[PDB]
Amino acid sequence: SLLHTFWRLPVAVFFEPHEENVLRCPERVLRRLLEDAAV
Amino acid sequence: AMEANIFCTFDHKLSIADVGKLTKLVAAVVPIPQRLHLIKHYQLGLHQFVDHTRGYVRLRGLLRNMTLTLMRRVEGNQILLHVPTHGLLYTVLNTGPVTWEKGDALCVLPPLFHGPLARENLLTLGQWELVLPWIVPMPLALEINQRLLIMGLFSLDRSYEEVKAAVQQLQTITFRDATFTIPDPVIDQHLLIDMKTACLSMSMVANLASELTMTYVRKLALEDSSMLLVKCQELLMRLDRVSPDDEIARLSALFVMLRQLDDLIREQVVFTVCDVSPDNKSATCIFKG
Amino acid sequence: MAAMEANIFCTFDHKLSIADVGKLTKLVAAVVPIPQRLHLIKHYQLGLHQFVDHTRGYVRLRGLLRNMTLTLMRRVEGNQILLHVPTHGLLYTVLNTGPVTWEKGDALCVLPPLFHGPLARENLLTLGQWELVLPWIVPMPLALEINQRLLIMGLFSLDRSYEEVKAAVQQLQTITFRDATFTIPDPVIDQHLLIDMKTACLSMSMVANLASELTMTYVRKLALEDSSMLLVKCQELLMRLPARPQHVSPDDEIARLSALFVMLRQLDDLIREQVVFTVCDVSPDNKSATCIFKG
Numbered sequence: 001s002l003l004h005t006f007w008r009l010p011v012a013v014f015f016e017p018h019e020e021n022v023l024r025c026p027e028r029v030l031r032r033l034l035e036d037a038a039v
Numbered sequence: 040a041m042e043a044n045i046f047c048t049f050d051h052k053l054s055i056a057d058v059g060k061l062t063k064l065v066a067a068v069v070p071i072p073q074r075l076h077l078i079k080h081y082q083l084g085l086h087q088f089v090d091h092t093r094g095y096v097r098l099r100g101l102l103r104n105m106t107l108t109l110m111r112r113v114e115g116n117q118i119l120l121h122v123p124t125h126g127l128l129y130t131v132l133n134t135g136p137v138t139w140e141k142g143d144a145l146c147v148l149p150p151l152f153h154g155p156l157a158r159e160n161l162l163t164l165g166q167w168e169l170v171l172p173w174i175v176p177m178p179l180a181l182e183i184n185q186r187l188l189i190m191g192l193f194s195l196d197r198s199y200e201e202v203k204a205a206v207q208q209l210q211t212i213t214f215r216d217a218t219f220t221i222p223d224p225v226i227d228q229h230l231l232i233d234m235k236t237a238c239l240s241m242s243m244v245a246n247l248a249s250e251l252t253m254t255y256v257r258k259l260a261l262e263d264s265s266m267l268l269v270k271c272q273e274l275l276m277r278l279d280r281v282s283p284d285d286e287i288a289r290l291s292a293l294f295v296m297l298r299q300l301d302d303l304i305r306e307q308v309v310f311t312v313c314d315v316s317p318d319n320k321s322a323t324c325i326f327k328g
Numbered sequence: 329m330a331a332m333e334a335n336i337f338c339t340f341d342h343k344l345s346i347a348d349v350g351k352l353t354k355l356v357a358a359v360v361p362i363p364q365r366l367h368l369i370k371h372y373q374l375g376l377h378q379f380v381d382h383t384r385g386y387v388r389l390r391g392l393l394r395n396m397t398l399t400l401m402r403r404v405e406g407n408q409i410l411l412h413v414p415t416h417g418l419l420y421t422v423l424n425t426g427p428v429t430w431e432k433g434d435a436l437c438v439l440p441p442l443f444h445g446p447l448a449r450e451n452l453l454t455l456g457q458w459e460l461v462l463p464w465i466v467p468m469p470l471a472l473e474i475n476q477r478l479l480i481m482g483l484f485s486l487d488r489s490y491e492e493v494k495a496a497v498q499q500l501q502t503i504t505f506r507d508a509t510f511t512i513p514d515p516v517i518d519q520h521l522l523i524d525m526k527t528a529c530l531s532m533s534m535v536a537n538l539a540s541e542l543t544m545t546y547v548r549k550l551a552l553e554d555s556s557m558l559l560v561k562c563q564e565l566l567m568r569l570p571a572r573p574q575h576v577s578p579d580d581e582i583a584r585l586s587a588l589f590v591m592l593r594q595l596d597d598l599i600r601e602q603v604v605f606t607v608c609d610v611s612p613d614n615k616s617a618t619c620i621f622k623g
Contacts, residue, residue, distance in 0.1 A: 009273045012263050073432060074608060104433055125417030125621075185589075189581055192542060195549055201576060209578045236558070242546035243562055244592070245539040250566070252532045258486040259529065267526065271533045278537070283492055287500075289565050290483065294476045297595065304592040328417075 045071070045108060047118035049080045051164050061162055062113045066130040066321070068147070068174060070105040074122055083118075084170045089154055094224065094231035095187065098149040100302050102172060107147060107309070123326040128313055131324045135173030137217055138319035144177035145310040145324060151221055177308055179214055183221060184303065186212065188241070191224040191234045237303060240296045247293045254281060333367045336399060336411035340371045342456055344407065351453065352404050357616065358423035359438070361396040361463055365413065374409075376440060376461035385518045387478055389440040393463055394601060398438065398623050414623035421618045422605060426464035427508050429614045436605035436619070437471040438463045443513050465605065470505050474512065475599045477503070481515040482525050524598055531595040538588045540581060541574070 013022075025033070072082055081087060088101055109129055111119040123129050133139060149172050152159070162169035175183070190209045193202055211220040224234050256272040263269065310324035364373045372378060379392060399413040400420065414420070424430060426441070441464050444450070453460040466474075477500060484493060503510040549571065551563050603621060610617040 007270075007273060008276060009269050011266055011269045013266070185582060185585060186578075189578060189585060192546065195546075196570075196573070199572065202573075205576050205578050238546065239550070239558070239562065242543045245535070245543035245588075246547065246566060248532050249536040249539055249544065252529070252536050255483065255486075256529065256533070261487075262522075265526065267530060271529060274533055274537055283488060283496065285565070287480070287484070287496060290480050291476075292562075292565055294479070294599070297592065298472060298476075298599070300592065301596065301600070304589050304596060 043122060044111060045074065045076060045078060045120040045122060047078050047080065047083065047120055048116060049118070051080065051167065053115075057162060058113060060160075061118075064110060064132060064134070064171075065113075067110050067132040067134060067171060068107055069110055069120060070102065070107045070147075070172060071120070072105065074106050074108075078120075081167060085149060085172065086154075086168050086170050089170070092231060093233060095149065095151075095234070096231075096237050096302075097233045099184075100233070102147055102149055103302055103306060105147075123328070125326060125328050128323055128325040129310075131174065131310060131322055133174070133320050133322060134171050135175050136219055137175060137179065137214060139176065139312050139315055139322050141312055141314055143312050144308040145174045145312060146177050146180050146306060146308050147172050148175050148180050148183070174310060179212070180306070182212055182214075184306075187221060187224065188238065188303065191230075192238045192241070194225050194230045194235070194238070197225060197228070237300070240299050243296045244293060244300070247289060247296070251286065251289060251293070254286070332365055332413070334413055334415070335367075336362070336365070336413065337368050338371060338374055338409035338411060339368060340407050340455075344455075348453060348455070349404070349406070351451075352409075355423075355460075355462070356401055356404055357421050358401050358425065359398055359463060359465060360401055360411070360460075361393060361398055361438075362411070363396055365397050372458070374460065376463065377459045380444075380461070383516070383518065384444075384514055385516065385520070386440065386442070386513055387521050387524070388518060390475075390601075391520060393438060393440055398604075400622075416623065417620070418622050419608070419618060419620050420622055421616050422465060423616050424465055424614070425462050426466055428464075428466055428470060429506055430467060430607060430610055430617055432607055432610060434467045434469070434607065435603045435621075436465050436467055436607060437601055438604055439466050439471060439474065440464070442474075443511055468600075468603075470503070470510070471601065472599055473503055473505060474510075475601070477501075477512055478515070478521070479524065479528065479598065481512070482517065482521040483528075485515075485517050528595065528598055531591055531598075535588060535591045535595065538584060538591060540584055542576075542581075545573070 069083055070085065071078065072087075085098060085102070088098060090097075106122075108120045108122050109131065111121045121129075139145065150170055154168060161171075186209055190206050193206060196202055197206070206223065210223065211218065224230065253272070253275045256268060256275065259268060260272065308327055311327055313323050313325055315322050360375055362369065362373050376389075376393070379389065381388075397413065399411040400422070402410045402412045412420075422436075426439075430436075441450070441461060444461065450459075450461075452462065481497075481500065484496060497515070501512045503512070547559075547562065547566065548569075551559055552570075605619045606621045608618050608620055
């Protein structure tokens with residue numbers, strides 16, 4: 001299920017909003033959206 | 040008024056043929072140990088430092104802090120040497136092997152041929168023998184120092200055939216009309232000591248750097264605020280695919296083995312060319328020291 | 329704006345006793361640092377005592393005095409000081425202030441004074457809570473040892489306990505260059521030393537990358553047959569593990585050692601500041617020396 005990335009060690013970012021943001025919903029919002037896509 | 044020169048005497052007797060040979064070198068580069076005002080003739084060049092068990096790299100160490108000078112006028116009993124200053128232009132003779140061009144960076148370099156030599160016709164005395172460091176362009180000096188360090192790094196395993204091919208194709212240099220070759224640092228399978236110290240310190244800083252940086256980025260991975268450290272240790276995890284006193288002594292050894300390599304990893308350009316006279320035996324180089 | 333003035337007249341505003349001007353007559357033909365390079369600057373710009381902080385970060389003071397503009401003192405008189413900021417290549421004299429005797433041939437550098445305070449008894453022109461703090465002129469062994477020990481003290485401050493760094497400073501803060509004791513003042517983690525640590529980390533990783541197999545196995549092919557006492561000292565600082573090598577190519581090792589040279593140059597500037605004064609010939613009391621590379 002989990003993906004396979006090339007760079008094995010993860011990178012700290014400047015967190016530019018000028019770039020694209022990175023999938024920033026936590027596990028609560030994931031489980032809630034699971035319930036909303038369910039019902 | 041006169042100019043701030045260095046008088047130089049000659050203790051041995053001088054003949055008219057020797058003065059006629061000496062007056063070819065009007066504006067020639069000459070090194071001096073310390074800038075006094077009356078020097079003897081045993082302090083004109085590197086023949087006070089020519090030795091058997093020591094070789095090229097010791098001469099490079101002595102030459103880089105030697106206070107060089109230019110001859111001005113030859114006459115009876117006295118040789119007027121001119122001390123060049125930073126920011127004036129000076130005529131300088133090309134006693135070297137290669138012609139220069141307009142704009143080449145020029146630096147001193149000891150002669151590759153020792154006292155035993157068949158091609159020299161220089162100022163010769165009963166024991167004293169005038170030698171003179173060449174001035175080559177800085178790409179040639181970098182290439183000579185680099186190729187000599189590489190073919191001195193193979194001073195231990197000359198039994199094999201492929202390393203003989205590597206050294207004998209590395210024994211020569213390729214420059215502008217130059218099939219010039221440089222002699223081997225290995226003489227009869229024992230190495231001069233300071234070349235051994237140079238390549239030993241090279242391998243030592245290499246092995247220390249390749250061993251301790253992984254432990255230090257393990258200790259550094261908690262302060263990660265910039266995007267450089269993660270790829271810095273991604274390199275170390277890519278390569279494979281502790282008591283405090285020992286690493287303290289290791290780090291001090293790292294910096295001192297680096298600090299003994301300043302003569303090799305850098306050197307300063309001495310002259311630089313403003314123009315080249317016709318027939319390429321002279322140039323009017325502005326000093327830069 | 330007009331040209332840079334080589335002649336700079338200083339001026340005190342407060343009263344001066346006879347003892348202060350007498351103590352200042354010894355400082356003729358010596359270095360004072362200034363940031364201004366105007367013509368008639370006051371004494372507030374003269375020297376380091378406009379820059380002493382609570383933190384006393386010595387690497388920060390080293391950088392700020394590196395950025396500073398040097399000059400030599402000339403012909404002190406009643407409430408005037410002529411300063412001669414020198415041109416690149418001429419020749420006049422300087423005067424030591426730190427307790428380092430000088431020889432010939434060794435280049436000099438500018439360093440802020442170590443262990444500065446009332447512990448070492450420097451009675452230099454105290455007036456109106458303004459002292460005159462001169463930079464020390466040390467030869468390049470002392471400067472390299474100070475910057476090297478500041479770099480190892482910046483490296484050592486990670487993941488080891490405070491007791492281990494306090495047990496290492498008694499081995500590391502001592503310097504005995506030319507029969508005189510020198511103590512490193514206050515090793516602390518500021519911003520500039522961690523910036524220099526970042527540059528050192530990148531340079532040491534890249535010189536670890538750009539090494540070939542022969543620089544790896546040189547000491548392992550040399551320590552098998554040769555027994556030198558330098559090899560006795562150099563063997564023990566590695567790990568444990570005739571022998572024909574696998575591959576060899578000089579026309580690749582040329583550029584590989586060229587890049588290792590440029591990385592060693594990029595590590596070398598973290599310790600060597602610059603050549604600032606070269607000494608020609610010293611006096612028989614070593615308290616004054618004529619020097620080239622004047623400024």
